[PDB]
């Protein structure tokens, strides 16, 4: 079934964080607003509603989340560890890091900006989008990436983690170090 | 060897200490409506795990929070009350914490006996050759 | 090493996130009373063989003194 207004109230804390862990909810109403953090870990939710607003961070670790629609506003970070997300939509306003470890993610939006750290660890992604900007640490360990785009920006450390990079960006300014 | 018993039993001594501290924080936060970190505390549990990697030490793999819904109480005049007027309190269950308190103490003390038992065997093994 | 054939100890706890459909968490089939007895039996039997091995060396040492 689907979450109602009264069922929403029974999964909210004092400061306004929605906890849906292991709960049997399949879809959320459109134009959904959360006062604080949102947790949809281990949920059978396969799609996030259009116009979704989260006043905190989105937690979807080891969930069945697959599709996020554009226009979603997230003030905190996005944690989609172990979910079933295959692509990242364009135009997501993310106020924090993006953790996509152990996901079937294949494609990323062009010129994507991550205000925090980025993770593509053990993902089947083949190539990073052109003009990528990362303000934190980039972990690509165990992924299928082997060629970086012509231009990219990482303001922290770059962790190869084991994968072999052969074509480095022509224009790259690094605020940290590169680790294998 | 008999020294591996000390590593295995010693790991359980630390393991049961983690669960005791987690229970202590649960008992002390059973009536705390507010919390720094913008999160209404929820009951935490230490999930043990055998690290097979003969001798199988026990390791704490991380603390996990309770899945029970928070206890909602209608307190309309509280500053933390929502529009409907309900304030939410942690889902700490007193009875399970008391049961965890007993089990953690009983398991902690029986690991001391095994370490003591292995100690005597090593001392006798050293008396051979003298 | 062989695992025991005793059925796992089932506990009703629809709060642990690692539970199942019926709210059951299965726990190891370890019996404390049989572990205490094994601890007593293992320690005593281990130290008994220390005495036999230690006394065996004495017999070997006395053999070297034959004819002296």
């Amino acid at each position: 079934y689907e979450l109602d207004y009264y069922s929403k109230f029974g999964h909210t804390d004092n400061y306004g964080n929605l906890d849906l862990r292991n709960k049997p909810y399949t879809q959320l109403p459109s134009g959904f607003v959360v006062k604080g953090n949102l947790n949809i870990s281990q949920t059978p939710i396969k799609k996030l509603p259009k116009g979704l607003d989260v006043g905190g961070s989105l937690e979807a670790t080891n969930s069945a989340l697959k599709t996020i629609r554009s226009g979603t506003k997230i003030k905190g970070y996005a944690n989609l560890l172990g979910s079933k997300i295959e692509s990242w939509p364009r135009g997501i306003k993310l106020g924090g890091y993006l953790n996509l470890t152990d996901t079937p993610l294949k494609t990323l939006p062009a010129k994507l900006r991550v205000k925090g750290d980025l993770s593509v660890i053990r993902t089947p992604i083949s190539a990073l989008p052109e003009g990528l900007v990362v303000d934190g640490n980039l972990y690509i360990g165990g992924s299928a990436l082997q060629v970086f785009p012509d231009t990219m920006t990482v303001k922290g450390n770059i962790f190869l983690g084991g994968n072999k990079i052969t074509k480095w960006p022509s224009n790259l300014t690094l605020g940290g170090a590169v680790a294998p | 060897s008999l020294f591996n018993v000390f590593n295995v039993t010693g790991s359980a001594m630390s393991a049961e200490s983690v669960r005791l501290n987690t229970t202590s924080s649960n008992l002390a936060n059973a009536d705390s409506v507010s919390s720094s970190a913008k999160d209404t505390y929820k009951a935490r549990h230490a999930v043990f795990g055998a690290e097979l990697s003969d001798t199988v030490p026990v390791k704490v793999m991380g603390i996990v929070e309770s899945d029970k819904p928070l206890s909602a109480e209608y307190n309309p005049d509280h500053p933390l009350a929502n529009e409907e007027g309900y304030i939410y309190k942690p889902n700490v269950n007193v009875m399970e914490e008391m049961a965890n308190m007993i089990s953690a103490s009983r398991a902690y003390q029986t690991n001391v006996q095994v370490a003591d038992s292995s100690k005597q065997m090593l001392l006798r093994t050293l008396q051979m050759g003298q | 090493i062989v695992e025991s054939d005793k059925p796992l100890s089932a506990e009703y706890n629809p709060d642990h996130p690692l539970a199942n459909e019926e709210g059951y968490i299965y726990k190891p089939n370890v019996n404390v009373m049989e572990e205490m007895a094994n601890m007593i039996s293992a320690s005593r039997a281990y130290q008994t063989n220390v005495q036999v091995a230690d006394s065996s060396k004495q017999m070997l040492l006395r053999t070297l003194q034959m004819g002296q």
């Binding site: 862990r21 905190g76 993770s119 934190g136 | 935490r44 795990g49 | 996130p17």
Partner: peptide
């Protein structure tokens, strides 16, 4: 890995991925 919902002891920062927990 192991448990899927372990916590993190580091203070919230919302910008750095917590490496305290086994994030795999």
């Amino acid at each position: 890995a192991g448990i899927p919902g372990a916590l993190s002891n580091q203070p919230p920062a919302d910008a750095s991925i917590p490496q305290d927990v086994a994030q795999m």
